[PDB]
Design a protein around this ligand. Structure first.
Ligand SMILES: CC(C)CCC[C@@H](C)[C@H]1CC[C@H]2[C@@H]3CC=C4C[C@@H](O)CC[C@]4(C)[C@H]3CC[C@]12C
Ligand SMILES: CC(C)CCC[C@@H](C)[C@H]1CC[C@H]2[C@@H]3CC=C4C[C@@H](O)CC[C@]4(C)[C@H]3CC[C@]12C
Ligand SMILES: CC(C)CCC[C@@H](C)[C@H]1CC[C@H]2[C@@H]3CC=C4C[C@@H](O)CC[C@]4(C)[C@H]3CC[C@]12C
Ligand SMILES: CC(C)CCC[C@@H](C)[C@H]1CC[C@H]2[C@@H]3CC=C4C[C@@H](O)CC[C@]4(C)[C@H]3CC[C@]12C
Ligand SMILES: CC(C)CCC[C@@H](C)[C@H]1CC[C@H]2[C@@H]3CC=C4C[C@@H](O)CC[C@]4(C)[C@H]3CC[C@]12C
Lengths: 145, 160, 96, 59, 132, 96, 48, 145
């Protein structure tokens, strides 16, 4: 019902145009999310039979960490590190690499990919804005009919 | 047109993938040519070799990911032996394309060949770390620590 | 002032209720065109004045005219809705 | 019908007037006019040289 | 020659004249008009149904060409022709002289769009009505 | 790159590797493959040659036509033609 | 047409034509896939 | 009082111009916020009489989740899932779909809508910057008068 409006209608047409850039962002993130997730879940929990909970943990924490919710208190609890500093005095020395992997990961996801999505949207909007207005004007008669 | 091997129907990802998975059910019917000749033509297409390379690397990523997530056994497991055979095969392919196809300078110029060397190197260090003392708990944790680095690189080789 | 007043009268007449009609189309177009021309002349002379002597041009823009209700040229320009005249550096310098 | 026909004629006259006032078109018209001007001068000299042969050498 | 079909027998002399213009142009080597008529897959009246003598000897009649152009525009284009106004019984009507020359102009217009002759197209477009 | 890559995927490329080594052994000691290929007929070669030559001539005619229709080029041609026109008038007066 | 008399131009665009299946010019324009014609202010004013 | 400044005044005029893009963003978000909110509140709390608290919960959590404050610990507590993994060993199997809905939602809100708002603001600013400067110069005399 927003397609009738002269402001909301062309924007809807451009949203459908940007969906390909959204798909491009999803394909690039999927790479870093599954790579970091398999690596991080294995470092946090070595010595555990594979189950459905392993798969959730790989998909669950890496995805929300890209929206700023960093589960560092929760990762500190899972790593069994008893020090005042968050990643010191741990049972295994390998689990202290989890914040490093995470740092690289959020550098890949927030710093690099999100800002490139902003760049692709600005370029895509400037390219297809006039075509969207013309297509909305044809759809104005289609909706009237 | 050269990518698709002079064909007009199998010219998308899904069409070549569907024909690749079901050879005897989609190839006789969807014949373009711009039975034996068509079978010899489709599988020599460069795109088909890509989809074979893509599926092979995807299974490698999934199998290696399962191996690093699941716990290591007290002896060298069956999946570990399969991965050992797979990475030797990868190592022999990298050496042949170095010594006997382009040249050492041409090979090392490419950034993906350098990443390939880093992958093979990471797996062999982690494997030998585990295989030196398979019942040692410390060897298993370090081995998984090196193999964490090994999985991120496999998922980037999908960017290629 | 006369060029600004002239530009305003022609732009308002071109969109007035008394010039609508099939036979007046070319006439209407001509008025808009002429309006634009008069606007250009008001800006152009102003620019020339500011090029020659900035202080005397400033003195000119502040002058009260007996013909209209003792309004200076900037008040006239605002009343004529001349955005081009008001955005000019000479006019802005006098306003500052 | 009368309105549409009248405006069709008006747009065609206006369109023709607009194309002849483009710069590219104006430069082409000066160019063919200049070539025709040299052609007219060549036939003029021919008449001049013919007249010279016809009269000056006859005396 | 006389034809058993009542639609093709109802046509006026000038309709046969445009049929002659299509026919003379069509006999030339590698002409796109013949290829278009052959690839159209229609009958003598232009209906999409895909005897032989009528379908080849009078393959370029105006009704069939009207159907081909209608399929070129869209799926529900259907140009309505009324040749009954060219009979002598309608001469007393005042504005008929414009109607008779507009419709006529239109078909010639269509012929000129087919053969891709813009100047002749513009002239027949100017003579008739419904310009836009 | 993927023209020259063996068909067999990675875990099974070892079969491709031993097959290539087998081909090298068969080639270096009693070669019998000969690397046979397919050669195009003279008719289709002369057809490709005729097409390429015809289109080369067409592009050169079209390119020449395009450069003479540029504005800059047109203005240069009127200019040298006008200078030649004055020259022709100077020799005409001399005759006059 | 829109420059000369906007209301009569609007009346012209709504006219049903006997030659085709009583289709106005905007229906014809949509059928002809003329994006330029449909995006014009006169056509848009009649559609509104 | 900032309209007098040569930097702050034109920006104020452009802020009033961008308010339409802000309204466009609000109309598009409202759709996802009420859809996700009704769905998420129903999945988290099936079997509860409708009250004013139901309406707050629908408006309350979905709105702040678009600013990065993800109430995942709070949603874990409300879902009655007792597992170490956040959305395992729950009383009802349907409530395990709440993180999935949420993922889609923040993909719709942060990834898609916020970046499109950035794109609309860049386009809108480039379009109406010169007109804003001219309008500020007319308002300079208006404020002086
Ligand atoms: C990716 C390339 C360029 C750089 C790689 C850097 C890696 C190898 C480095 C960066 C930080 C490092 C960690 C920093 C500190 C410690 C604590 C120590 O008690 C054991 C080793 C450990 C856990 C290190 C392991 C190796 C480490 C993860
Ligand atoms: C400008 C930017 C890129 C600066 C980058 C900062 C990097 C070098 C910092 C930020 C966070 C850091 C990590 C934070 C905590 C730990 C756990 C500790 O037990 C070993 C070192 C380790 C793993 C650090 C390694 C270095 C690190 C990754
Ligand atoms: C370019 C990149 C891939 C280089 C990767 C280097 C990796 C494989 C190596 C470099 C340094 C290594 C670490 C060095 C020392 C220790 C402390 C030991 O008690 C546990 C293993 C641990 C934590 C190692 C894990 C593996 C490690 C991180
Ligand atoms: C929107 C379209 C494209 C995709 C829809 C995917 C939906 C149907 C899928 C994605 C993840 C799925 C959930 C994943 C795991 C579980 C736990 C299981 O014990 C019950 C089903 C449940 C809760 C699934 C329900 C269906 C589910 C929500
Ligand atoms: C690149 C981006 C788009 C990757 C998308 C990741 C998706 C597929 C992931 C991220 C968070 C995931 C959810 C996290 C937790 C749970 C609860 C569990 O009980 C069932 C599966 C479910 C519901 C997951 C479904 C899959 C999920 C939605």
């Amino acid at each position: 019902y927003y397609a009738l409006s002269k402001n909301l209608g062309p924007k809807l047409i451009m949203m459908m145009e940007m969906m390909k850039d959204v798909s491009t962002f999803v394909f690039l993130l999927l790479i870093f999310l599954i790579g970091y997730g398999v690596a991080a879940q294995s470092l946090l929990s070595p010595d555990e039979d594979f189950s459905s909970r392993t798969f959730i943990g790989v998909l669950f924490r890496p995805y929300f960490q890209i929206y700023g919710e960093l589960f560092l208190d929760d990762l500190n609890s899972e790593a069994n590190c008893l020090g005042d500093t968050p990643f010191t005095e741990c049972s295994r020395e390998t689990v202290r690499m989890v914040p490093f992997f995470l740092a690289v990961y959020i550098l890949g996801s927030n710093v690099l990919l999100v800002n490139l999505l902003i760049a692709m949207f600005n370029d895509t909007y400037m390219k297809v804005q006039e075509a969207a207005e013309d297509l909305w004007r044809k759809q104005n008669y289609e909706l009237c009919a | 047109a050269d990518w698709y091997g002079h064909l007009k129907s199998v010219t998308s990802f899904w069409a070549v993938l569907f024909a690749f998975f079901f050879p005897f059910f989609v190839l006789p019917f969807i014949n373009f040519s711009e039975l034996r000749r068509k079978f010899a033509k489709f599988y020599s297409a460069p795109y088909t070799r890509f989809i074979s390379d893509l599926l092979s690397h995807f299974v490698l990523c999934v199998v290696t990911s399962y191996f690093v997530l699941d716990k290591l056994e007290d002896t060298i497991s069956a999946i570990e032996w399969i991965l050992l055979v797979w990475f030797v095969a990868l190592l022999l392919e990298e050496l042949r394309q170095m010594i006997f196809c382009d040249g050492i300078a041409e090979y090392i110029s490419d950034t993906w060949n350098r990443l390939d060397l880093i992958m093979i190197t990471l797996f062999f260090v982690g494997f030998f770390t585990h295989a030196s003392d398979p019942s040692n708990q410390d060897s298993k944790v370090v081995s998984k620590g090196i193999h964490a680095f090994l999985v991120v690189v496999l998922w980037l080789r999908f960017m290629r | 002032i006369n060029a600004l007043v002239a530009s305003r009268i022609l732009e308002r007449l071109s969109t007035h209720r008394a010039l609508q009609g099939p036979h007046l189309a070319e006439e209407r177009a001509k008025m808009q065109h002429n309006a634009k021309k008069f606007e250009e002349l008001a800006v152009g002379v102003l620019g020339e004045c500011h090029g020659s002597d900035s202080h005397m041009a400033s003195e000119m823009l502040h002058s009260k005219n007996d013909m209209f209700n003792k309004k200076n040229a900037i008040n006239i320009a605002y009343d004529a809705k001349s955005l081009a005249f008001l955005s000019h550096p000479a006019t802005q310098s006098v306003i500052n | 019908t009368t309105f549409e026909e009248l405006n069709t004629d008006k747009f065609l006259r206006r369109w023709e007037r607009e194309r002849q006032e483009m710069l590219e078109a104006r430069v082409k018209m000066t160019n063919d006019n200049v070539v025709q001007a040299m052609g007219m001068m060549d036939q003029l000299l021919e008449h001049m040289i013919s007249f010279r042969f016809s009269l000056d050498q006859q005396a | 020659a006389k034809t058993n079909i009542t639609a093709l027998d109802e046509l006026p002399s000038f309709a046969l004249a445009i049929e002659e213009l299509y026919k003379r142009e069509a006999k030339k080597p590698h002409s796109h008009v013949q290829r278009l008529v052959s690839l159209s897959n229609t009958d003598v009246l232009g209906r999409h149904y895909r005897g032989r003598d009528l379908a080849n000897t009078r393959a370029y009649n105006v009704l069939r060409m009207d159907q081909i152009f209608a399929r070129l525009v869209s799926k529900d284009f259907s140009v309505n022709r009324d040749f009954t106004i060219y009979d002598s019984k309608y001469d007393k009507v005042p504005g008929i002289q414009f109607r008779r020359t507009a419709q006529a102009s239109h078909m010639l217009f269509l012929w000129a769009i087919c053969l891709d002759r813009f100047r002749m197209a513009r002239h027949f477009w100017l003579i008739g009505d419904q310009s836009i | 790159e993927y023209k020259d890559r063996p068909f067999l995927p990675a875990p099974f490329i070892l079969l491709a590797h031993v097959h290539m080594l087998f081909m090298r052994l068969l080639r270096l000691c009693g070669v019998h493959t000969q690397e046979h290929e397919k050669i195009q007929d003279d008719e289709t070669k002369r057809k490709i040659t005729t097409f390429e030559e015809l289109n080369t001539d067409k592009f050169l005619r079209r390119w020449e036509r395009e450069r003479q229709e540029m504005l800059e080029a047109r203005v240069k041609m009127t200019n040298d033609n006008v200078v030649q026109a004055m020259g022709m008038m100077d020799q005409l007066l001399e005759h006059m």
